[PDB]
Symmetry: D2
Subunit: 194 residues, 4 copies
């Protein structure tokens, strides 16, 4: 049932920040594999739940989280990147200033925790609806961001940057801000507020 | 269909003096019942999220399903694993115990030790690994079901399993539970696991 | 130097009827004492592994240090967080509670709810985040110390913290503990965290 | 104090299984960084333990495990690879046959669980001294193999194969057996038995 979404841009449009080969592999192989496996896992899960094998249904959870999370995360990620991303809306900039002091402080803080992820993971700018504040967080592997609405994600799995940056993850994390799609991020903010 | 609290295979006081009637009554009627009730609610929510294609919501419900589903699975096995007159391991289970642990005494020591060592709430398990065709021992956190092997005998070390009687002295409970291990059931589970 | 079990700032029966003298005596003299005794042993082993350059061994000891070290830290704070006559939040803490949670009633509800919801053994905490200069609530598993923020008030939901008195009814204990929250201490911790 | 060990071979000696660029980066950047950070963490830890900040000492644990584990794991890994690895000793082959049926079954089973690692991790062939049997296991991130003596490890962090294999982790896992250093593995087995 789930399908690989088309990117909102061509494979080379994020250069020089992220290469054509990376976009191509990342979308057509990595995200595709999460979608394919996700469809298969939902299948195994239904069989277990419909036949009453609660134990097997529990055993299938990590695979749903990993693949389901991979599909969720990458789907958001593509919308979060743009050749010409613009700037935050007035409402978002104001909120950024409120909760982080400045965009510069937010970028530094999110870059820092994202760079610090041990192993594979994601860094996120999110909106917490209960306390009505922007927050930053990281997630391991493909765990989706929970407890807050995702606004902007930074994939630090090595496949997100290795072909171009090799070991130098910090340069990729710092450079991704150049292609942050503030139009999309601001839209996600607006919707998270409503 | 809907999960139900299974009746115990004995009366609440049948395991004294190893486990008190008060413990047995709370443990079954309050703790296991709660897992069952919560499990039914969580399964309904999970079925809804799956049906609606709400992947994030389905994922968010997973800890609750594992906790309550695991609570149900674990306690259901645990009741069948206890008996005033449990008997002795079947010849084939005793022979396998000897083959894999040297003796029953060794198995009891090793499983008791790892079970006592559980940090916080959890369970100690004797299981059968079908791939390598061997008995193994393991512990699980919280209500995580034993996975990767077939459960044979479980020891609940959540403080509610023993506190009212044993207080802080978890080792006394773990050592004593062997006196009420239902070897008839454990042997049946073993025979079933080798099919 | 060697860790020691701190004396309670009150007598074992001083918190009745909210927490029984039996609970207080076991909790301090057996559970906390055990963390302290084990912590000293683990620190010695860890110091040895570090000195010898046994990296694998030092790493293997980490769960035991976190569990016992955390047990010590957590209980030490917990004793100071309880009082028969705790008083009321300082004006600055009350004002911050209002700023960050709307009211004290809201804070108590929100912290009680997440604390009640802890799966297995753990703790509920009111803390102060120094970076964002805000109060926050969180839970921790087992004896994991609250990290990333300064602990202000903790609620122990290990079953040994309440089972003898409350049995399975954890919510009654969590709601009731607010009646013995030592606001004098919590306020001092808050003032200290904003330095 | 800790230092980057020299490889027991030249950077291109594992070709065509693992490329010169991978060996170079993997050793001179990735393993080097674990060593450098490990030294720094031990420093922060000592200050915390010597000043009696138990809380800070606990906070430093993940960093010691990650960096300490990275140093342990990669140190073993280099010794586990060879252009001409030979074959298992008679004692090891016999033990492999005892606990897995055949070398083919062991390779399939270890390859399978290693391929299945979600995110970054390692696959291991180890020896359990208590039960006196070979076992296979996986570890997340840089967690060292615990509870058994390591004999042969397969690094499946994406940096271990991405430049050459890209997304195709299974081809790298299957191909690494060509360069398994059975001389070293058999020596580790012998020592684990004593
Ligand atoms: Mn990715
Ligand atoms: Mn129980
Ligand atoms: Mn306690
Ligand atoms: Mn590596």
């Amino acid at each position: 049932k789930h399908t690989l979404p088309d990117l909102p841009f061509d494979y080379a449009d994020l250069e020089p920040v992220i290469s054509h080969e990376i976009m191509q592999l990342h979308h057509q192989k990595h995200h595709a594999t999460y979608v394919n496996n996700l469809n298969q896992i939902e299948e195994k899960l239904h069989e277990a739940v419909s036949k009453g094998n609660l134990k097997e249904a529990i055993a299938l959870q990590p695979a749903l989280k990993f693949n389901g999370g991979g599909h969720i995360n990458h789907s958001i990620f593509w919308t979060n990147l743009a050749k010409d991303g613009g700037e935050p809306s007035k409402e978002l900039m104001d909120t950024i200033k409120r909760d982080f002091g400045s965009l510069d402080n937010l970028q530094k803080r999110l870059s820092d925790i994202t760079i610090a992820v041990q192993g594979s993971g994601w860094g996120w700018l999110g909106y917490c609806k209960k306390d009505k504040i922007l927050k930053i967080a990281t997630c391991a592997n493909q765990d989706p961001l929970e407890g807050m609405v995702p606004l902007f994600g930074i994939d630090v799995w090595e496949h997100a940057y290795y072909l171009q940056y090799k070991n130098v993850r910090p340069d990729y994390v710092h450079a991704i801000w150049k292609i942050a799609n503030w139009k999309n991020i601001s839209e996600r903010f607006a919707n998270a507020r409503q």
